[PDB]
């Protein structure tokens, strides 16, 4: 139920839709910063906490953004296979456990930011399934945080 085979399939579809054969491999950054900006707004978190403390034009923060969108992509594209997704998420979990300043309440903020931006870019976005799944991913990463 909670983010089932179909939900995931659509998510992975619409996600690979925002990153189709024309967009992906060009501006994951434009999408990425958009994510963060939306993140900072909701989470309230201090941008002065990531590489280069935000600054959309900071070589470090960019690389940082890239690595975030990537992680998200790795997890999303694996929602169909539960077993391995849990692993992927736990790994992420561990990485954040080791970062003083990551609250479970925020992980979901960042997770909801992805969904929201996806919808902005992809109007078709099944905002119901996305949250259903991004909820799952937000649980694995911020598990216990």
């Amino acid at each position: 139920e909670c983010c089932s085979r179909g939900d995931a399939e659509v998510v992975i579809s619409e996600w690979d839709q925002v990153f189709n054969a024309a967009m992906a491999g060009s501006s994951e950054s434009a999408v990425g910063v958009a994510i963060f900006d939306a993140f900072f707004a909701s989470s309230g978190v201090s941008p002065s906490m990531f590489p280069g403390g935000g600054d959309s034009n900071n070589p470090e923060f960019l690389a940082q953004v890239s690595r975030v969108v990537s992680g998200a992509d790795i997890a999303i594209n694996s929602l169909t296979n539960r077993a391995t997704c849990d692993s992927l998420l736990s790994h992420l979990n561990a990485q954040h456990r080791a970062i003083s300043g990551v609250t479970g309440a925020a992980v979901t903020h960042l997770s909801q930011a992805i969904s929201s931006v996806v919808a902005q870019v992809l109007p078709s976005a099944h905002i119901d399934a996305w949250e259903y799944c991004m909820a799952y991913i937000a649980a694995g990463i911020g598990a216990g945080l």
């Binding site: 590489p51 070589p59 960019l62 690389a63 890239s66 990537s70 296979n81 391995t84």
Partner: protein, 140 residues
């Protein structure tokens, strides 16, 4: 090394193989499969990620992060400042593990033995040039 044009071929061909591919988990696992078959001395170098069983959720999780990283880099090949930073991040994530130059050189052989099979066209050089660009970045 990986010039403006050699970056094109590669980016498109990676999309054509890794992108078009069925389930990355297989493509990803397949990659490390080679790395081991062309340099067994490394198979144990991943004693952490449950290499004992490559079909494990544990191990597959790892292969994905790599084909994933390998992906988050190729798309950044045009962004010098950005990819340099990312590469720095990665290169340092490999600091702990004792990696020689034969490992990376093996990795490239692994990556370039997998990719071509999934394409109709594949530029030998252009790829090596860029794998280099990446390999270096992730070590020195």
């Amino acid at each position: 090394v990986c010039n403006r044009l050699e970056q094109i071929l590669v980016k498109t061909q990676w999309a054509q193989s890794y992108g078009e591919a069925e389930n990355r988990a297989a493509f990803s696992r397949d990659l490390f499969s080679e790395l081991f078959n062309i340099q067994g001395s490394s198979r144990a170098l991943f004693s952490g990620v449950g290499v004992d069983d490559m079909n494990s959720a544990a191990f597959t999780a790892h292969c994905l992060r790599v084909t994933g990283a390998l992906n988050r880099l190729i798309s950044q090949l045009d962004q010098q400042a950005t990819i340099n930073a990312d590469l720095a991040h990665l290169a340092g994530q490999h600091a702990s593990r004792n990696l020689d130059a034969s490992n990376f050189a093996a990795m490239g052989q692994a990556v370039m033995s997998v990719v071509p099979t999934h394409l109709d066209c594949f530029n030998q050089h252009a790829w090596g040039e860029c794998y280099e660009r990446i390999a270096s970045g992730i070590s020195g």
